[PDB]
Ligand binder design. Sequence first.
Ligand code: ZN
Ligand code: ZN
Lengths: 48, 117
Amino acid sequence: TVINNWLLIEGHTIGIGDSIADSKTYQDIQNTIKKAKQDVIEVIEKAH
Amino acid sequence: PGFVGIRFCQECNNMLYPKEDKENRILLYACRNCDYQQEADNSCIYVNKITHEVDELTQIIADVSQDPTLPRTEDHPCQKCGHKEAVFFQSHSARAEDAMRLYYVCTAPHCGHRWTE
Ligand SMILES: [Zn+2]
Ligand SMILES: [Zn+2]
């Protein structure tokens, strides 16, 4: 009862902004995937 | 070894069965429905390949170069004709048991050459 009445002041939400990273985070995520896929190709090249 | 096939009777085309000529001490193949008997050239009656070692290149069909859905590469040229494009695929089979070998077939029509790397 008291803390729900405090949330009437602070509020809470979720939106599109929370789901978005910065540009450099995206560049790091993408560079991880780009290498990971190339590593799988090297495993395939040895198997083949 | 390889494998051992069948012989058929000249008189009646039933299967010939192996039996010994016990007095000449020689293997015969003999019909069970008629008097026909044939001297064996081979001595071997039977072979059985538990490891299943056989050259799968005898089982690749050259017509498969026509398949739109297989990947093909100029990166592995054909020996017999020099043609650059080959189609490549795995065993497409059971009984490879483990391997992921690629087999290559030349994509040049009427070459049909097959090899493994
Ligand atoms: Zn017969
Ligand atoms: Zn060829």
